[PDB]
């Protein structure tokens, strides 16, 4: 029913015209997107796995084709706060309409969902886990190299998963753990493993995770599923928050401190093929 005109509608689902640009930026900003593979769904879905072989010939032997069914659950969430307060809802939103509101919002909510997807994706330090993660896969299938930045060890991480399961692909590494990789050198030929211009150790693309958790850490993943539905129902209320923190070390009081807030809710979900490498130091 609604198009542009006005905004006196606190609750309800977004129009899919204004939804789909935000998901674009969620994907662009996220590193897990660049590592994983998307697919369409509605709420909760079952899907199948693995390759298949060609029949039609006279048949002699060949290996059998493995199949397995996977289910997806769990929902994301986001109390926006910062923009709703700055443009005092209703009457200022009347000038901003339904359209120009979400156009201005788009940037930061996409980055916010990105940050949580990666924080509760590669490792358990994120707030909302769903079942399986990369850290948890490492705990089950234990393969660790401890405190090494030589040439050989780089191949071992790939060789571990190029033995049980097939084919290595992309790397991940934070900004602090970057200069050490550039400093490495081959004794035979004058050339660097990690290239400064193009982020690739063994000629496979690497991405930079900004979350301040790791110190010395590298992991490999190829086949991986990232899942979004795309219903971001917005709900606006002005009462005391739990997550939001105001200025110093005080509980955020939207009634007392005359603010206003909006909440958005995505549908984040993963699944893991359980064979991933790991590196971490010990010393003492």
């Amino acid at each position: 029913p609604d198009n542009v005109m006005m905004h006196e509608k606190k609750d309800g689902t977004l129009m899919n015209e204004f939804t789909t640009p935000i998901l674009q930026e969620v994907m662009e900003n996220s590193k897990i997107m660049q590592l994983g593979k998307y697919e369409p769904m509605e709420g909760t879905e079952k899907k199948f796995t693995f390759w298949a072989d060609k029949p039609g010939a006279y048949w002699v032997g060949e290996g059998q084709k493995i199949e397995t069914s996977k289910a997806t659950w769990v929902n994301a969430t986001m109390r926006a706060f910062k923009l709703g307060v700055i443009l005092p809802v209703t009457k200022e939103f009347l000038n901003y309409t339904y359209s120009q509101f979400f156009e201005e919002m788009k940037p930061m909510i996409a980055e916010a969902f990105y940050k949580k997807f990666d924080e509760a994706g590669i490792l358990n330090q994120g707030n909302n886990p769903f079942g399986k993660s990369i850290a948890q896969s490492i705990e089950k299938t234990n393969k660790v190299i401890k405190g090494d930045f030589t040439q050989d060890n780089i191949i071992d991480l790939e060789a571990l998963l190029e033995d049980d399961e097939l084919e290595a692909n992309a790397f991940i590494s934070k900004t602090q753990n970057r200069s050490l990789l550039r400093k490495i050198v081959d004794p035979e030929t004058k050339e660097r493993i990690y290239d400064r211009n193009s982020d690739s150790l063994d000629g496979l693309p690497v991405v930079n995770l900004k979350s301040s958790n790791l110190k010395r850490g590298e992991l490999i993943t190829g086949d991986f599923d990232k899942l979004i539905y795309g219903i971001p129902q917005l709900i606006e209320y002005k009462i005391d928050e739990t997550a939001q923190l105001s200025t110093v070390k005080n509980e955020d009081g939207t009634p007392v401190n005359l603010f206003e807030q909006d909440m958005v809710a995505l549908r984040a979900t993963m699944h893991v093929a359980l064979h991933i490498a790991d590196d971490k130091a010990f010393a003492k």
Partner: peptide
């Protein structure tokens, strides 16, 4: 839609 957009702007392959 999402899978096609992902594949269009994915770093792997392409």
């Amino acid at each position: 839609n999402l899978a096609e957009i992902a594949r269009q702007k994915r770093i792997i392959k392409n």
